């Protein structure tokens, strides 16, 4: 059942409401939002990407 990803080949967005459930990027760093998560992501070039969602 487990599928751990997600579809943010469209951020970064300019800004945000922080909502707060976080994740961990693979770059030991939690998230506040899917927004410092997938802002994360586009600056990576694909490398960071998600570890799991929820804190760490």
Same mark, same amino acid.
């Given at each position: @059942?487990?599928?751990? =990803?997600?579809? +943010? =080949?469209?951020? %970064?967005? %300019?800004?945000?409401?922080?909502?707060?459930? %976080?994740? +961990?990027?693979?770059?030991?760093?939690?998230? &506040?939002?899917? +927004?410092?998560? +997938?802002?994360?992501?586009?600056? =990576?070039? &694909?490398? @960071?990407?998600? =570890?799991?969602?929820?804190?760490?």
């Amino acid at each position: @059942l487990a599928a751990v =990803s997600v579809d +943010c =080949s469209e951020y %970064p967005k %300019p800004a945000c409401t922080l909502e707060y459930r %976080p994740l +961990c990027g693979s770059d030991n760093k939690t998230y &506040g939002n899917k +927004c410092n998560f +997938c802002n994360a992501v586009v600056e =990576s070039n &694909g490398t @960071l990407t998600l =570890s799991h969602f929820g804190k760490c």
